[PDB]
């Protein structure tokens, strides 16, 4: 909504090679701030953003205990699911979980999430009401009944309405100067001749934060929808993102084309042209 916090988790069984590998990372908006990898020497949750490092030793200890506890629960859950789906112990399997909260500018919960997937397909998810479940097949329906009986939705709901939101606002204030500042895209158009008769115009949006952005190409003000090649937004590797859009045009027609950029870091949507 206005801001968000998310935790991602992946356990992968490794039959004939070792205990399942467990990896989890947390984000506030599009900023990574913590990671835990069970394959790390003496595994501990570690800081990955500047503003979280001020948390004290009890924070790092409790977060590490939660991670090792989730790594164990997933191992058991991997065993359970082999039974629910009647699979062999010799095959590798993946369990994924994402939960977190979005808050509005009031700083209250807008939406909470808690969902899981087995082997890359939906398994069971907490609905928006933070009260009922959507199970994706009959094995997940076993889980659903057990989780209804054990009143699990209620515990997650208390967390997502409380602790989730409270520490997000904490992270937002402590990391205010980076997380509450939108970095607008640096834009420009390049021109790449294909032959003597045609060329590609590529509209670049670089160094921006957050990741969300709209890039479009228009010819004499009309949208070149089915003709633009639009790559997926990608990390520059310095916590900002990059994106480009391209269109191939007839030589001599270049100046009829316009690139239009929307990003919340921009006061108004940009229009740019190749300035030869």
């Amino acid at each position: 909504g206005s801001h968000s916090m998310r935790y991602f988790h992946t356990s992968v069984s490794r039959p004939g090679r070792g205990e399942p590998r467990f990896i989890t990372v947390g984000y506030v908006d599009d900023t990574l701030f913590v990671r835990f990898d069970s394959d790390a020497a003496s595994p501990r949750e570690e800081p990955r953003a500047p503003w979280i490092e001020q948390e004290g030793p009890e924070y790092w200890d409790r977060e590490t205990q939660i991670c090792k506890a989730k790594a164990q629960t997933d191992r058991e859950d991997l065993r359970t699911l082999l039974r629910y789906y009647n699979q062999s112990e010799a095959g590798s399997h993946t369990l994924q979980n994402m939960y977190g909260c979005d808050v509005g500018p009031d700083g209250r919960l807008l939406r909470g999430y808690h969902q899981d997937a087995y082997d890359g397909k939906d398994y069971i998810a907490l609905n928006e009401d933070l009260s009922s479940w959507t199970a994706a097949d009959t094995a997940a329906q076993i889980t659903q009944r057990k989780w209804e009986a054990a009143r699990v939705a209620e515990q997650l709901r208390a967390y997502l309405e409380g602790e989730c939101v409270e520490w997000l606002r904490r992270y937002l204030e402590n990391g205010k100067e980076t997380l509450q500042r939108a970095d607008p895209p640096k834009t420009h158009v390049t021109h790449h001749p294909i032959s003597d008769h045609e060329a590609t115009l590529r509209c670049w949006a670089l160094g921006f934060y957050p990741a969300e952005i709209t890039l479009t190409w228009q010819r004499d003000g009309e949208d070149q929808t089915q003709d633009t090649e639009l790559v997926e937004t990608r990390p520059a590797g310095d916590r900002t993102f990059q994106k480009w859009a391209a269109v191939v045009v007839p030589s001599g027609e270049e100046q009829r084309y316009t690139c239009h950029v929307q990003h919340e870091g921009l006061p108004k949507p940009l229009t740019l042209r190749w300035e030869p």
Partner: peptide, 9 residues
């Protein structure tokens, strides 16, 4: 800060 709840499938 992570949820401490440990639930099992």
């Amino acid at each position: 800060a992570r949820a401490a709840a440990a639930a099992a499938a």
